[PDB]
Amino acid sequence: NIVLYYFDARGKAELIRLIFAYLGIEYTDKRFGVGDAFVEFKNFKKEKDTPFEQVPILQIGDLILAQSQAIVRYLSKKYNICGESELNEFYADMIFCGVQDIHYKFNNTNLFKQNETTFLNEDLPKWSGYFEKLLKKNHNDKYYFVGNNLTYADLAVFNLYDDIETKYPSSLKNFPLLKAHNEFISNLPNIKNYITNRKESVY
Amino acid sequence: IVLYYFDARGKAELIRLIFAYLGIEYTDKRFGVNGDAFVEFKNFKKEKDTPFEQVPILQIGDLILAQSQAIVRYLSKKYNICGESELNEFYADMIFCGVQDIHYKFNNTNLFKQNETTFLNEDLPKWSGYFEKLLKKNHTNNYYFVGNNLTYADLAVFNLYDDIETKYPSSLKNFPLLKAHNEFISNLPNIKNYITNRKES
Numbered sequence A: 001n002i003v004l005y006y007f008d009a010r011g012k013a014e015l016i017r018l019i020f021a022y023l024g025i026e027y028t029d030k031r032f033g034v035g036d037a038f039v040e041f042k043n044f045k046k047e048k049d050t051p052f053e054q055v056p057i058l059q060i061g062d063l064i065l066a067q068s069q070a071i072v073r074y075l076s077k078k079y080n081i082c083g084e085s086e087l088n089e090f091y092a093d094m095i096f097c098g099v100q101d102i103h104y105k106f107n108n109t110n111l112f113k114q115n116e117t118t119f120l121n122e123d124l125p126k127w128s129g130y131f132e133k134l135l136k137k138n139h140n141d142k143y144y145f146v147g148n149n150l151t152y153a154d155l156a157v158f159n160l161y162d163d164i165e166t167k168y169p170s171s172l173k174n175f176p177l178l179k180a181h182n183e184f185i186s187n188l189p190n191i192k193n194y195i196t197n198r199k200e201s202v203y
Numbered sequence B: 001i002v003l004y005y006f007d008a009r010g011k012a013e014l015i016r017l018i019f020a021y022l023g024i025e026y027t028d029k030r031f032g033v034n035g036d037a038f039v040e041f042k043n044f045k046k047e048k049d050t051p052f053e054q055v056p057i058l059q060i061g062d063l064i065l066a067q068s069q070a071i072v073r074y075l076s077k078k079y080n081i082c083g084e085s086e087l088n089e090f091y092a093d094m095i096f097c098g099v100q101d102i103h104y105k106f107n108n109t110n111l112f113k114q115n116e117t118t119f120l121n122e123d124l125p126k127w128s129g130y131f132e133k134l135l136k137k138n139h140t141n142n143y144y145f146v147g148n149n150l151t152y153a154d155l156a157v158f159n160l161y162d163d164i165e166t167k168y169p170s171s172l173k174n175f176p177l178l179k180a181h182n183e184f185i186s187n188l189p190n191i192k193n194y195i196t197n198r199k200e201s
Ligand SMILES: [NH3+][C@@H](CCC(=O)N[C@@H](CSCc1ccc(Br)cc1)C(=O)NCC(=O)O)C(=O)O
Pocket: A007, A011, A012, A053, A054, A055, A056, A066, A067, A068, A069, A107, A111, A203, B097, B101
């Protein structure tokens, strides 16, 4: 039995949820605070043998899995969406690591208030440019960052801009390949239904 | 094989440690040794096609590799210091990700000038305890984090505390397994020699 534990938010769990949706995998989506999230989280840590007292936690039977990035890589490798060669697996990894750099900057701004000006004027346009150039290098209909098949890097980049656009909607106007890519991912047979019918608000 | 970074440990030191451990020969190219670091990095970016205008960059022939964690995972698989099973590779990955969380906190304090007291009183002993408990788990009853051979997770944890100890010696008094683990790594021939040469030898 597969259980995902996180707060009632998208945040560090949403890419995992997107991956489960894409892969057609059955799981329980357990969210703290759907009463008191604070008390529930305290109870959770005492009940479960957590390595770092953080969520997301993925529990597969009696297996406890922690660290969102490790979980992402574990699933993508298991279900063949990590790239279809050793180098492509690297490139997928490199792109996901890049997503993490800019996502961290967005999180600090969106969540923990650090003024948005720097992010919006300096970080976001510059990083959008990096991703645009990476897509151009590999560029249907279909838009992949790595090879000629969907990788978790595609889902990661999709999730990044989906998260950013919840707070800042007009972020992709100047980046046509990136816009197209994110449109492509959102309309994938297994993604479309999940994204449109998941409860709003995360972070 | 050419590694490009600043003349600093930072985000390149684990890669350097891994190369040292594996006995792989490479050119360790550092900005600002012979000239202006700010200027050399500007020219580097114009000359080399980097994906995110960041270093470290590992260049194999014409192949450009970026992102330190990606490089680390890639090298670990290439030279079999990854996990010895699917789940073991997960655990090594998870621990490396844990290292990133606490290392980030150290970097904010050590380099980026912020709140040393929160790191020292609330982050470091708590994360050291997490790592100590992970070490206890792998031994169970009756050194390594994952399996009974060295993984990149071992080297990542070593580098973490090695970095911390340059500012805060010695954070490992209360954590004997972690103390023993890191002592063991530092005394491996290839590692010991890299360390002594690093401090000029
Ligand atoms: N490196 C870990 C980070 C996990 C983490 O920080 N988890 C927080 C989640 S709540 C806070 C928060 C909310 C949104 C984002 Br985006 C990031 C962080 C936690 O459990 N924290 C436990 C605690 O604070 O005691 C991972 O990727 O799995």
